[PDB]
Curated annotation (Swiss-Prot), chain A:
Residues of the full protein shown: 1110 to 1291 of 1291
Protein task: Responsible for host epithelial cell transcytosis, host nerve cell targeting and translocation of light chain (LC) into host cytosol. Composed of 3 subdomains; the translocation domain (TD), and N-terminus and C-terminus of the receptor-binding domain (RBD). The RBD is responsible for the adherence of the toxin to the cell surface. It simultaneously recognizes 2 coreceptors; polysialated gangliosides and host synaptotagmin-1 and -2 (SYT1 and SYT2) which bind simultaneously to adjacent but separate sites at the tip of the HC.
Region (C-terminus of receptor binding domain (C-RBD)): 1-171
Membrane topology: Multi-pass membrane protein
UniProt motif (Host ganglioside-binding motif) ranges: 140-143
Protein name (database record): Botulinum neurotoxin B heavy chain
Organism from which the protein derives: Clostridium botulinum (strain Okra / Type B1)
Upper lineage: Bacteria, Bacillati, Bacillota, Clostridia, Eubacteriales
Cellular localization per UniProt: Secreted; Host synapse, Host presynaptic cell membrane; Host cytoplasmic vesicle, Host secretory vesicle, Host synaptic vesicle membrane
Gene: botB
Coiled coil: none
Highest taxon of source: Bacteria
């Protein structure tokens, strides 16, 4: 995903690859795209602990230029696949900001899921963040039914992973 | 792409969508219904093969019957079946893409009568009337004399040999053997030299068979036939001597091998191609290099010569562009596995070209607006209730 | 024997060179009894190949490269088939025989040592054809010179163009932004780099040079002073936005030049390819900060000339510098275009009597456009929060002609805009009073802002006396709280365009103490009008005070009230400086 | 603001519509003293692409289908290349600049609520061209309105709206009647194009027959007996018509406007009317009409110095001369015998079984038998 210059919707771009000098080595760059950050919602846990646990309400921000912008969604929409709203940190009565990070795969995996909820104390559930086909980064309510199937589908569009800058990965 | 579903065997011959053309240069004519751009259906049986073959020449495991597709009711049922199969293929995005590629992949047209794809000659017509002071003899209109004179080879000629209809694919009925889908070219030389050629398909949509615990969708068989036809349309057809070792005949007392043509391996999908299409390649022939070189030559011929010509039509100039948009590796890396995955159709996966030796097939009849539909088999591929065909007793058995 | 310095020289000897022994190879026609006959050919490819006569020092690649560098590029020009034809009616009853041959351009490259030519190579480029006709009788002997040519010769002007081989203002009142200017049609290149060819017509004959468009390939030209942002693709995009230019390197438009010579002397027709010139300029602060030139292939140009007298010696003239010559009419059409680097917002609902638009956060303090339409034709006052910043208004050219949906906005995607009014000073305090039509799409350009406070753009439908200041930008003056002299500099509008200044006179209102106010200008001349302004619930009630003034160096004052709020409207009738400078001298 | 009932309406505003901001995108020509400049074009493929400007509730398919059903069909007519050209002669000591545009046909689909238009889509069909010429001096200033066009306008002004919702003494037999060659269809369904020729200029429309495909029109009252093939066979039997859907004979229309005023030339596609009647006891029991594509019609008119007119009903208008050629044909359902010897002075032919039939014979000498 990359932030669009005009529209407030992240556009989907094809990753780069390695074609510099060697045909024996091939990979794709992972340090591309917008740098995402995760922040707490209520600051109710212990300050000493700073790891992200399963089923946690948080704010998923990203660094644009020299500012941090949050991702929201509309309260009401008709189609299942609804685009996101990428805006600076602000308070509104017509957008949802809290994202519940969860893990659905019973088998060990590095992929997590992001759900949108009306409130931390509200049973209302909006949808799951994903990518749906021109590819578009959106949220869907159809993922909710497909995520509870007994044979879990690991190739779904809701499976998200976070790549930090590591000393073992170069370029 | 939009399949013309408003046709029937009782439709009048209007010389635009329903025609009566001549089969090759023989004395037999046949009706043809255009169901898509450059896609036609001939609901009768094939004309090349005699329907009454000698008993000594019948192949093992083939239903031979010289009365199938003889009445108008059966012909209309065949036409509706082909329409339903084409519409089912067109429903999915991959099937629509394949059908569009089939429609737009016209065989490469020849040059002018003197040779070449560059600009044609010129002719001046309509001299203005003489004025009171000026002769006005040179005040005329200049037009290209042989406009759109590239002599296409993909056409069906009417019974009078005076009307010609462009066509890439003709879907006939089965030949002598009822259960035998086949894909035959129109001209071998134009099919093996990168030019391109017309393709004819013998298809049997009414009989299916059961493998493991599921029935074979005839749409996947039609898709396989179309993919094989794409080889003839692009002119990339290897020689009949380019075969690969397919199976070791363990039932025999001598060391013998059963071999398969590379086209069948590349089209049929399954697991066998995974043992040849490897990175790096262990099996390579001059056929791939020659095909790539000839395709590049034809693409250059289009790009430099047949592209800037302002005296040829966009009916060809713009299909040739779309045909040469893709690469040859796209055709080579296109097999039944991709369509099976995108359609969720279960198909035989090991040695699917040698299923005659492994087990005997039982054939089930398909009523098309009863069992098949726009979405495929009713109640899925497994729980569909298909009656066993009465022709199972006629399967000739030659061990 | 030459009169040039030592070295190597590229020489062009002109058109109309007929070769030896090549007469009567294309054939000839016989007519009689006043019957008109036409003969023509087509120089496409095979009969359009060059003839090389090289030298050990001057190989084929060398001569070809030098010729194409200095003179017309024959390799890319012979790819386009160019036709020609001749017509010659027969006289009274005597048989007439005509025959057609080719003509060539002769390109000599010479090696001058001392002042004598010691080496020469020849290049023959097939240009066009030439028809030679005679009147004959059955059994009459014809001179051999008519049929057979022994030596190469020129049937046209004796040209000699040599080039040595080297071993290597005006005030524009436009607003800030991007402009596309059509600078005219008929642009050819120097040194006959665009010459389709020359054709010689004998007396009593007709000749035509035709482009039949058998091939659509054309070759546009492109120059730029800044390739980083003004690239060929960028200029093509801007041309498409401005003039809807669809095809750039492809053209299907036949053009044919026909000339009938008088029956007393021969004539010659030179056919050239022409170009339409488009300047894409980035104009900021009254100066062209960027410029690109795009020459789009036009439909040729025909020149009619007379054959010069044969009793004239050759003159070795040097070639001209690389450039362009305009042969068509004087034209200059300026169309502003929308900067593609700035995002465009939309207001789908048509603007009613009142509407307030909140600036979205996605802009994040950047210049941008908003697209809006108005439900009813009328005069609207458009402003922002306390009249900050100064915002400009445009008008999409040709909008509202095609689409229509009453009460809604149809985005016509028209990027060609016509500037109406506004300022380019973000710190200035002003509001626009414009006239908007019922079915036209308008753009409002919000400039670069340097504040975090959210702004609100307000459109108010004015039905009062504010109709007087039609299509103006009322400039608020607030730093007027003392006596003396003040100057205010703004972007001067064009001729017959309006500017306005709303000001207030220091001191309390006492119906007395009429201060002397002297309003004038420095360079521009404008008709000035003054109004008194009365603020009500419904708006403003303009009260006429003075009319038909002359601001340019005005030396007259007005005993005018203090504490009141007046409005001075200026219509510039003479543009002398890019920036207008209003001087207000206030005295007790 | 319109005076019509509420609902959707298909409107044609005629051809000769020049668009805005794109006048000399095709380039122009500069003609020196004496010579003639001919600027032309051949609308075949890419310039023959219609421009759709749709609205909500009027998609491309809706407007396209409505305009094809009511007015002329452009999808099939654009496959045939049609050429047009202008010729202008420059003065003896002056320079002339002429530039070419495209003139389209403005089609609209309006929605009338109350007595005002609330919605409107537009469809532009590329019709023909238009050459604007001026005579200029070097360094002479030319009015900016000569080159640029701010808004669309029609250079020819109509508004056609449609609301969307004698004794014959012939023996009993088969007759083919050529009833004339001038037939065009109503509502300008066969309009090849219209050119506006300025004063002192010449215009020309050519059908160059670069693609030899023509479309005949067939109507019948009984498809069982009088079908397409049957009528074609009868026409080939009567007038020996060998080509029906393909013609290689090409036609051109040239018009030179006077130096006083402009002129407008309209080229249409015509038809030849071939009736096929089955005459039985003095009554036409079956009639089938065939319309064979002819070589066009030319009309010359002058621009007037508008009225919302209702569209006309379907039909044909004959602009050619009054023709009626009646040729009897042999019934194909009746057997034909022959006598291979000429009748000299006395012959007896012995007779098929109780079926009407023909006997073909000839006489050895002219005489009364």
């Amino acid at each position: 995903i990359k932030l669009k210059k005009d529209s407030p919707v992240g556009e989907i771009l094809t990753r780069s690859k390695y074609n510099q000098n060697s045909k024996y080595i091939n990979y794709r760059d992972l340090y591309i795209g917008e740098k995402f950050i995760i922040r707490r919602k209520s600051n109710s846990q212990s300050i000493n602990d700073d790891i992200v646990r399963k089923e946690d309400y948080i704010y998923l921000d990203f660094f644009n230029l020299n500012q941090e912008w949050r991702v929201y969604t509309y309260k009401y929409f008709k189609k299942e696949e609804e685009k996101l709203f990428l805006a600076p940190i602000s308070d509104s009565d017509e957008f949802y900001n809290t994202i519940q990070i969860k893990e659905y795969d019973e088998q060990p995996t590095y992929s997590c899921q992001l759900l949108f909820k009306k409130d931390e104390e509200s049973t209302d559930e909006i949808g799951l963040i994903g990518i749906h086909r021109k590819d578009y980064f959106c949220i869907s309510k159809w993922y909710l039914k497909e995520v509870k199937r007994k044979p879990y589908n690991l190739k779904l569009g809701c499976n998200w992973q976070f790549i930090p800058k590591d000393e073992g990965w170069t370029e | 792409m939009n399949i013309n579903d408003n046709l029937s065997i009782n439709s009048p011959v209007d010389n635009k969508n329903v025609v009566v053309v001549r089969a090759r240069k023989t004395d037999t004519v046949f009706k043809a219904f255009k169901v898509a751009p450059n896609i036609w259906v001939a609901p009768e049986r094939y004309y090349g093969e005699s329907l009454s073959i000698d008993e000594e020449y019948k192949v093992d495991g083939g239903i031979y019957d010289s009365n199938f597709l003889s009445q108008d009711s059966e012909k209309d049922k065949f036409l509706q079946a082909i329409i339903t199969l084409l519409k089912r293929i067109n429903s999915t995005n991959a099937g629509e893409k394949l059908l569009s590629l089939i429609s737009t992949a016209i065989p490469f047209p020849y040059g002018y009568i003197g040779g070449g794809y560059y600009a044609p000659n010129m002719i001046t017509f309509g001299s203005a009337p003489k004025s009171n002071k000026k002769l006005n003899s040179l005040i005329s209109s200049t037009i290209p004399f042989p406009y759109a004179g590239y002599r296409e080879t993909n056409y069906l000629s009417s019974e009078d040999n005076k009307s010609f209809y462009a066509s890439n694919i003709v879907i006939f009925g089965p030949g002598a053997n009822i259960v035998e889908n086949n894909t035959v070219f129109y001209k071998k030389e134009d099919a093996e030299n990168g030019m391109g050629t017309m393709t004819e398909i013998w298809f049997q949509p009414f009989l299916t068979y059961k493998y493991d615990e599921f029935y074979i969708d005839p749409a996947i068989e039609l898709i396989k036939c179309l993919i094989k036809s794409l080889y003839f349309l692009y002119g990339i057809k290897p020689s009949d001597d380019l075969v690969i070792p397919y199976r070791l005949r363990s039932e025999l007392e001598n060391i013998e091998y059963s071999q398969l043509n590379i086209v069948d391996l590349l089209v049929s999908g399954g697991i066998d191609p995974k043992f040849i299409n490897t990175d790096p390649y262990w099996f390579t022939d001059n056929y791939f290099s020659n095909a790539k070189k000839v395709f590049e030559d034809h693409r250059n011929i289009y790009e430099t010569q047949i592209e800037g010509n302002n005296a040829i039509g966009n009916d060809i100039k713009l299909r040739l562009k779309q045909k040469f948009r893709i690469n040859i590796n796209d055709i080579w890396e296109l097999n039944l596995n991709y369509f099976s995955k995108e359609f969720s159709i279960m198909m035989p996966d090991r040695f699917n070209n040698a299923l005659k030796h492994f087990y005997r097939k039982q054939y089930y009849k398909i009523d098309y607006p009863e069992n098949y539909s726009i979405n495929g088999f009713v109640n899925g591929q497994i729980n569909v209730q298909l009656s066993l065909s009465d022709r199972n007793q006629d399967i000739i058995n030659k061990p | 024997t030459i009169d040039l310095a030592d070295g190597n020289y590229v020489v062009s000897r002109g058109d109309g060179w007929i070769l030896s022994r090549q007469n009567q190879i294309l054939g000839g026609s016989v007519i009689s009894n006043g019957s008109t006959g036409i003969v023509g050919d087509l120089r496409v490819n095979d009969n359009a190949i060059p003839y090389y006569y090289p030298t050990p020092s001057f190989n084929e690649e060398y001569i070809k490269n030098n010729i194409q560098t200095v003179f017309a590029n024959f390799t890319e020009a012979n790819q386009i088939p160019i036709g020609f034809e001749f017509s010659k009616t027969a006289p009274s009853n005597k048989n007439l025989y005509m025959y057609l041959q080719y003509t060539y351009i002769r390109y000599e490259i010479i090696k001058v040592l001392q002042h004598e030519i010691i080496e020469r190579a020849v290049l023959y480029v097939p240009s066009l054809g030439y028809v030679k006709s005679i009147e004959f009788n059955p059994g009459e002997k014809i001179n051999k010179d008519f049929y057979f040519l022994t030596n190469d010769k020129c049937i046209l002007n004796e040209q000699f163009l040599y080039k040595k081989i080297l071993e290597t203002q005006r005030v524009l009142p436009y607003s800030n932004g991007l402009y596309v200017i059509n600078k005219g049609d008929g642009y050819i290149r120097t040194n006959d780099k665009d010459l389709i060819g020359t054709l010689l017509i004998e007396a009593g004959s007709s000749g035509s040079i035709i482009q039949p468009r058998l091939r659509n390939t054309t070759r546009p030209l492109f120059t730029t002073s800044n390739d980083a942002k003004f690239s060929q693709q960028y200029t093509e995009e801007r041309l498409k936005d401005a003039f809807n230019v669809q095809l750039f390197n492809t053209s299907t438009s036949l053009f044919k030049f026909v000339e009938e010579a008088p029956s007393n002397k021969n004539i010659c027709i030179k056919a050239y390819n022409t170009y339409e010139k488009y300047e894409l300029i980035d104009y900021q602060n009254g100066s062209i900060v960027n410029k690109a030139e795009y020459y789009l292939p036009s439909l040729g140009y025909c020149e009619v000339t007379n054959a010069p007298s044969p009793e004239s010696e050759v003159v070795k003239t040097q070639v001209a510098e690389d450039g362009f010559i305009q042969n068509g009419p004087e034209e200059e059409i300026v169309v502003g275009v929308i900067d593609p680097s700035e995002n465009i917002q939309e207001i789908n609902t048509a603007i009613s009597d009142n509407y307030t638009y909140n600036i979205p956060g996605i802009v994040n303090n950047n210049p941008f456009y908003i697209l809006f339409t108005v439900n009813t034709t009328g005069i609207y006052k458009i402003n922002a929060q306390n009249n900050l910043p100064s915002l400009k208004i445009y008008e999409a050219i040709g909008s509202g002609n095609r689409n229509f949906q009453s009460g809604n906005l149809c985005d016509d995607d028209i990027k060609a805009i016509n500037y109406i009014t506004g300022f380019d000073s973000p710190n200035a305090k002003s509001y626009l009073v414009v006239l908007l039509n019922k079915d036209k799409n308008y753009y409002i350009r919000v400039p670069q802002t340097s504040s975090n406070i959210e702004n609100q753009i307000k459109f108010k439908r004015e039905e009062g006396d504010l109709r007087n200041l039609m299509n103006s930008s009322v400039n608020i003056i607030d730093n007027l709280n003392s006596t003396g002299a003040h100057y205010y500099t703004r972007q001067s509008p064009d001729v017959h365009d309006y500017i306005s200044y709303e000001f207030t006179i220091p001191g309390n209102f006492n119906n007395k103490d009429t201060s002397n106010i002297r309003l004038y200008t420095s360079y521009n001349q404008g008709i000035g009008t003054l109004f008194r302004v009365t603020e009500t619930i419904d708006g403003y009630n303009l009260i006429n005070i003075q009319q038909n003034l002359n601001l340019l160096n005005s030396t007259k004052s007005i005993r005018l009230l203090n504490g009141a709020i007046y409005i001075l409207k200026v219509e510039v009738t003479e543009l002398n400086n890019y920036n207008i400078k209003l001087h207000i001298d206030i005295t007790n």
